[PDB]
Design a protein around this ligand. Structure first.
Ligand SMILES: CC(=O)N[C@@H]1[C@@H](O)[C@H](O[C@@H]2O[C@H](CO)[C@@H](O)[C@H](O)[C@H]2NC(C)=O)[C@@H](CO)O[C@H]1O
Length: 369
């Protein structure tokens, strides 16, 4: 089993106890640590924060304490958008520039692989031609990594990708059967199924459909997303089930209607540390005073409300349920977005350090023995 965990290079800017610093990294918590995010400059892999090189040294330095640990660098993310990927994959020359730059960069900074997080080929401004060009990029990287291993005698660089759960994005961008052959593993982003972009409450990451749902909505759940990727050709052993350590929040139209599917007027109030309306870290909801926690029976996940605020999130129990699910489906492990949104320092939830991610590790039987 794998436990793949994302580090984010902006968590260092949060205030107080929420500030995530190198000391908070645990070398033995996860099997694979992925650094979010690198970017691109003139079609070449590049840093995004002023101190990334310092953090790369710390991050990859964890392997001295745990030599089993593998690290990867993720390029892209939601904010990064699509234009630079589109421009880079548009020609064989630009892809070659990128691929060669990536190999050099990963070797220079001591990463074990690259995670592609283009959000997304064929969507978010990216043209339809990018579906096949993404397939080609994945193949180019896989083949070049194979060649570099042969030439250098070094252990081959890993290639993974973070991929969307929703059919609209999957069909616009992803030749699943083809890319799954060339990826070492596939990080399924089984979250952001619902959120304050929608005019009714809905859970960030429900396991199953609700009885009331129909049409496309009935596939906006973890089980449907997993089955989608498997049926379209991803080997179960390569499919890694993403898990969110955050929730999605709403302002309710009325404090008297707190149901799943209740009318909402917009994003929930920003959290005191995360300061992003519409999301909250686990540590911002686990200890919410004077609130009412509820469970969506069909969907196997909790929500919580207080006055006109409503948040769908994951807890220890829902993580356990999801690991039982992934094991039943024979998946390759779990992925988590993100280290710094769990109660990484045990300051809020009275559950110790990393209560959610330690749950994943325990349920996957990955506890350091
Ligand atoms: C999850 C993953 O592998 N990739 C995506 C992430 O980028 C995204 O997190 C969001 O990243 C933005 C930077 O690109 C941040 O500005 C934003 O705060 C952050 N959101 C959260 C809730 O952490 C995650 C989660 O939405 O999903 C993918 O879209």
């Amino acid at each position: 089993a794998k436990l793949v965990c994302y580090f984010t290079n902006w968590a260092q800017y949060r205030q107080g106890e929420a500030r995530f610093l190198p000391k908070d990294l645990d070398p033995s918590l996860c099997t694979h640590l992925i650094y979010a995010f690198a970017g691109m400059t003139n079609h070449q892999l590049s840093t995004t924060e002023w101190n990334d090189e310092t953090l790369y040294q710390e991050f990859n330095g964890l392997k001295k304490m745990n030599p089993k640990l593998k690290t990867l660098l993720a390029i892209g993310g939601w904010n990064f958008g699509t234009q630079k990927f589109t421009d880079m994959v548009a020609t064989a020359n630009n892809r070659q520039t990128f691929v060669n730059s990536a190999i050099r960069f990963l070797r220079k900074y001591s990463f074990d692989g690259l995670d592609l997080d283009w959000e997304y080929p064929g969507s978010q401004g990216s043209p339809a031609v990018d579906k096949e060009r993404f397939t080609t990029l994945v193949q180019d990287l896989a083949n070049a990594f194979q060649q570099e291993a042969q030439t250098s005698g070094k252990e081959r660089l890993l290639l993974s990708a973070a991929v969307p759960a929703g059919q609209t994005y999957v069909d616009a961008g992803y030749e699943v059967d083809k890319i799954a052959q060339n990826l070492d593993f596939v990080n399924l982003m089984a979250y952001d199924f619902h959120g304050s972009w929608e005019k009714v409450t809905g859970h960030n990451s429900p396991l199953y459909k609700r009885q009331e749902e129909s049409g496309a909505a009935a596939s906006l759940n973890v089980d449907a997303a997993v089955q989608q990727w498997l049926q379209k050709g991803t080997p179960a052993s390569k499919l890694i089930l993403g898990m969110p350590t955050y929730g999605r929040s709403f302002t309710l139209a009325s404090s008297s209607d707190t149901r799943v599917g209740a009318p909402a007027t917009g994003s929930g109030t920003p959290g005191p540390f995360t300061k992003e309306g519409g999301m909250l870290a686990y540590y911002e909801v686990c200890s919410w005073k004077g609130a009412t926690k509820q469970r969506i029976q069909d969907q196997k996940v909790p929500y919580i409300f207080r006055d006109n605020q409503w948040v769908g999130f994951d807890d220890v129990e829902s993580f356990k349920t999801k690991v039982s699910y992934l094991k039943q489906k024979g998946l390759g492990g779990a992925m988590v977005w993100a280290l710094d949104l769990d109660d990484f320092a045990g300051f809020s939830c009275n559950q110790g350090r990393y209560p959610l991610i330690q749950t994943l590790r325990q349920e996957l039987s990955l506890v350091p023995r």
